[PDB]
Structure 1
C-alpha cells in the first residue's frame, strides 16, 4: 500500500489514487463525501454534514453527477457533448475532489477551489475540461472542486417555508468550503490562503460568496470568469421564485407549502427535470428556471446593492471575459441562427432576436437596445446584424455585469485585475462566426492542452502554461505578475486597464466595452424605473 494515498480527515480515513501527468505524478482524492445524501425527505433542504465513518472510504473516481437536464441540441456534436454529464445522474451527488502534488507537500501550500458553471441548472466536477492534474503538477497548488445541487433540486424556492427555503445549492458550496477549512491541511494545503475561482454560473457563485458574510470568512481571493452575481440571469426575486416553483408543482400534478413540497418529493427526479424549461415567463436565451433567490439570508439585498455598498479593502480579485460572450446563446432560440450555416440574419430577425435576448423589458427599453446596436449607415447588413445581436446578448448578460463589478470593487478597496481572453482554440468545433465563445478559456486555465491525447498546437501548450502561471501567481500572492521579471496593471475605475490573453505577449488595453456598458449599467436601469 502507498502511504501517500492515505489521508485521514475529520470524518475518517480516505484512500486516493496516483494520477499520471506528462510532467509527473499527482495524488488525487476523487469523490470524498461532504454531505449526507440529499434524498427523500432531504430533497430541497439545506445540506447536512457527512456523519463520520469507520474503515476507509475509497476516493478513487468521480462520483455521480447531480440530476440535471441533458443538452440535446446537437446530439453527438463535440461542442455540446463536452458539457454533458459523464457519470450517472443521481440525487446522491454531494462529493468533492482534492488534487495535491506527489508526494504530498510538507510546507502549507496555497489552495484553489473550483466552482463549475452551467446556468445553475447543469454542470459537474467530473467533466474532462475541469481535470485538475495539470494545474497541480505545473504550479504545485492544492486544487479542490465540489459538486453542488442544480436545477429544482438546488434552487427551487418557496421563500419563507421550512421545506424549500431556496439557495441550497449555494449552501452545498458553502459546506464544501467549510470542509476545506477544517481538512485541507491534511492534504498539505494551507487554509489561510484559499482562492475561489469559477466560470459563468460558477463565477456568479464566487461573487455571491463575496457578498455573503458567512462565506466571506472561508476564502481570501477570488477569480470570476465570464460571470458575476449581478448578472440579470443569476438571481431572481422571491415572488418570481414562488411563481416558477408553483408552476412546476402544478405541471407535475402537485397541489400550504408543506404539502406542496411533500408532494414534490414523491416525484421522480426526471419528472421535475422534464418540466424545468416550461416555467420560464418569456421566450428567451441565457435565462434559467431555478437560480439563487434574494430572500434576505444568503443575500441580504440584491447583488447590485451589496456591491455598491461594500467595503472590499483587503480583497484581491481577477475578472475577465472571452472575446465573443453571446454567440453560443443565439443557436438556443434566436431566429435565423444555426451552427451549420453562417446565421446571416435579416433585420426583422434581428429585431425579433433582441426581444429573445433581452427578455422581460419594456418595448421602450427594447427600442433603446435597437438604437444603440444598429449601425444606421448599414441597418440591413446581415453580417453586422449578426455580430450586433451577439454583442447585445454578451454585453447584457456577461460583459457589462462584470465591468460594473470590477469598477465598484476597485473604487471600494479591492485590488482588481482584468482580462479579455482572445484566443480561439485550434480544436474548437463551433463555427468560425462564433469567434471565441462562452466557456472556451477553461481548457487553457486547467492545462488540458498538455494532455498528449489531445491535438493542440505547441503554441497553445505554451499559452496554457502561461495562463496557469498567472492564475497560480494570483492564488499565491494576489497578483498575477511574475514576482521577479510585460506587466499586467491593476484595473481601476478611472484608467479601466485590462490585458488581452492570446498567443502574443500581454497587451494593455483600456475600457471593457465602456460605451456599451454605460447604457446597460447607467441608462437602462433609470428607464426601467420610469
Structure 2
C-alpha cells in the first residue's frame, strides 16, 4: 500500500490514486462523500453531514453528476458536449474531490476551492475542463471541488416551509467548505489560506458566500469569473420562487394547500420528471433566465445581494474578478431570432428589436426602448453585422459585465483590494464559429492548465499562456496579489477602473469595464424601473 494515497479524515479512512501529469505525479482523492445522500425523504432538504464510516472508502474516481437537464441543441458538437454530464445522473451526488502534490506537502499549503457554473441548473466537478491535476502539479497547490445540487433539487423553495426552505444547493457548497476546514490539513493543506474560485453561476455562488456571514469564516479570498451574485439572474424573490415551486408541482401533478403535502407529493416523482418540466415554469421564454436559482429568503441572504454589497465592509478581503471578451455571443445561439452557430447570424433590425426583449426579459416597454437607444448606432441603424455585435453586447453587458463591474467597484471602495481582467484569447481549438469571438466560459480551460494535456492539440504558445495564467491564479491564492514578488497588474479602483487583458501578448493595462454601457445598466435603468 502506498502511504501517500492513504489519508484519515474525521469521518473515516480514504484511499486515493496517483495521477500522472506531464510534469510529474499528483495525489487525487476523487469522490469523497461529505453529506448523506439527499434522497427520498431528504430531497429538497439541507444537507446532513456524512455519518462516519468504518474501513477505507476508495476515493478513486469521480462520483455521480447531480440530476440535471442535458443540453440537446447541437448533439455531438464539442462546444456543447464539454459541459454535459460525463458521469451518471443521480440524486446521490454530494461528493467532493481533493488534489494534492506527490509527495504530500511538508508545510501547510494554500487551497483553491472550485465551484462550477451552469446556471444553477447544471454542471459537475467531474468535467474534463475542471481537471485539477495540472494546476496542482504546476503550482504545488491543493485544489478542492465539490458537487452541489442544481435545479429544483437544489433551489426549489417554498419559502417559510421546513421541507423546501430553498438554497440547499448553496448549503451543499457551504458544508463542503466546512469539510475543507476540518479536513484539508490531513492532505497537507492550509485551512487558514483558502481561496474560492468559480465561474458563471459558480462565480455568483462565490459572491453569495461572501455576503453570507456563516460562509465568510470558511475562506479568505475570492475569484469571480464571468459572474456575480448581483446579476439579474442569480436570485429570485420569495414570492417569485414560491410561484415557481407550485407551478412546477402543478405540471407534475401536485397536489392531486399544505406546504408539507405539496412537497411530499413532489418527492414521489422520479427525478427525470422534475427535470423535464423544470423550465416550463419561467414567466417568459428567454435567454439568461433559469427557473430555480438562490432565493433572497432572509436567511442565507439576509437581504438582496446589492443591498448586501452596498452595506458591506470588505477590509481584509482580496478579490479577483473578470470576464471574457465576448460574454454575450454564446447565449444568442440558444434562442434569439436569427442566430445560429452554423451561419454568420447577420440579423435584421426587426430581429434585433425582438432579441432585445428575449435578452432583457421582464422589463417595461419604456425600458426596452432605452436599451434600443443606447445600443443602436443611429448612423448605421440597420447594419446586420453591427446589430449582431450590439445584441451580443446587450445581453452580455446586462447579465455579466455590468453586474461584475458594479461588484468590483463597491468592493474596491469599501475596503477590499480588487483585481480585474478581461480574457481575450480565442483558443486555437475552439469549435464555435469565429463571429462569437471569445465566448463565455472559454478561459476556464486555460486557468486549469488543460493545454498541458498531451492528448490535446493546443499550440506551444497557448501552453505557455496557460502556465502564466495558472501562476497568476496561484499567486493570488497565496499572496492575494497575482503579481510575481515583468509588467505589473494594477489593482482595480472605483476611480481609475484599471484592469488587464489576458492573451498571448504581455499584460496591457486598460481603463473601464464597458464604463459607458454599464453606466446605463447600473445607474440609470434601475431608476427608470422605480419611477
- Same-fold call, TM > 0.5? yes
Q: What is the rounded CA distance, in whole Å, between the counterparts of 1:91 and 1:280 in structure 2?
A: 23
Q: Show CA shifts across 1:129-171 (max 9, x none).
A: 0000000000001000000000000000000001100000000
Q: What is the rounded CA distance, in whole Å, between the counterparts of 1:145 and 1:400 in structure 2?
A: 27
Match of 2:421 in 1: 419
Match of 2:123 in 1: 123
Compute the displacement of 1:472 (Å): 0.1
Q: What is the rounded CA distance, in whole Å, between the counterparts of 2:234 and 2:529 in structure 1?
A: 19
Alignment: residue pair count: 527
Match of 1:476 in 2: 478
Compute the displacement of 1:15 (Å): 0.1
Compute the displacement of 1:212 (Å): 0.2
> Aligned runs of 1:125-140 on 2, under 5 Å?
125-140=125-140
Match of 1:490 in 2: 491
Gaps of 5+ in 2: none
Match of 1:161 in 2: 161
Partner SS for 1:337: coil
Q: Show CA shifts across 1:227-263 (max 9, x none).
A: 0000000000000101111110000101x10000000
RMSD between aligned alpha carbons?
Answer: 0.3
Compute the displacement of 1:438 (Å): 0.3
Q: Show CA shifts across 1:392-437 (max 9, x none).
A: 0000000000000000000000000000000000000000000000
Partner SS for 1:278: coil
Partner SS for 2:206: helix
Q: Show CA shifts across 1:177-212 (max 9, x none).
A: 000000000000000000000000000000000000
> Aligned runs of 1:143-292 on 2, under 5 Å?
143-254=143-254, 256-292=258-294
Normalised to the residue count of structure 1, the TM-score between the two structures is 0.99
Q: What is the rounded CA distance, in whole Å, between the counterparts of 1:331 and 1:289 in structure 2?
A: 19
Q: What is the rounded CA distance, in whole Å, between the counterparts of 1:333 and 1:239 in structure 2?
A: 27
Q: What is the rounded CA distance, in whole Å, between the counterparts of 2:246 and 2:266 in structure 1?
A: 10
Q: Show CA shifts across 1:328-364 (max 9, x none).
A: 1001110000000000000000000000000000000
Is 1:404 the equivalent of 2:393? Answer: no
Compute the displacement of 1:225 (Å): 0.2
Q: What is the rounded CA distance, in whole Å, between the counterparts of 2:109 and 2:4 in structure 1?
A: 16
Q: What is the rounded CA distance, in whole Å, between the counterparts of 1:183 and 1:115 in structure 2?
A: 18
Match of 1:428 in 2: 430
Q: What is the rounded CA distance, in whole Å, between the counterparts of 2:279 and 2:303 in structure 1?
A: 27
Q: What is the rounded CA distance, in whole Å, between the counterparts of 1:355 and 1:50 in structure 2?
A: 45
Compute the displacement of 1:25 (Å): 0.1
Gaps of 5+ in 1: none
Q: Show CA shifts across 1:83-117 (max 9, x none).
A: 00000000000000000000111100000000000
Match of 1:357 in 2: 359
Partner SS for 2:25: strand
Q: What is the rounded CA distance, in whole Å, between the counterparts of 1:299 and 1:54 in structure 2?
A: 37
Q: Show CA shifts across 1:476-514 (max 9, x none).
A: 00000001xx00000000000000000000000000000
Q: Show CA shifts across 1:445-471 (max 9, x none).
A: 000000011000000000000000000
Q: What is the rounded CA distance, in whole Å, between the counterparts of 1:280 and 1:302 in structure 2?
A: 20
Q: What is the rounded CA distance, in whole Å, between the counterparts of 1:197 and 1:80 in structure 2?
A: 22
Q: What is the rounded CA distance, in whole Å, between the counterparts of 1:59 and 1:258 in structure 2?
A: 36
> Aligned runs of 1:336-351 on 2, under 5 Å?
336-351=338-353
Normalised to the residue count of structure 2, the TM-score between the two structures is 0.99
Where has structure 1 moved over 3 Å in runs of 4 or more? Answer: none
Match of 1:375 in 2: 377
Compute the displacement of 1:24 (Å): 0.1
Partner SS for 2:121: coil
Compute the displacement of 1:4 (Å): 0.2
Q: Show CA shifts across 1:40-95 (max 9, x none).
A: 00000000000000000000000000000000000010000000000000000000
Q: What is the rounded CA distance, in whole Å, between the counterparts of 2:106 and 2:183 in structure 1?
A: 15
Compute the displacement of 1:283 (Å): 1.7
Partner SS for 1:277: coil
Q: What is the rounded CA distance, in whole Å, between the counterparts of 1:140 and 1:361 in structure 2?
A: 48
Q: Show CA shifts across 1:277-297 (max 9, x none).
A: 100001210100000000100
Q: What is the rounded CA distance, in whole Å, between the counterparts of 2:81 and 2:16 in structure 1?
A: 28
Partner SS for 2:386: helix
Q: What is the rounded CA distance, in whole Å, between the counterparts of 1:100 and 1:15 in structure 2?
A: 13
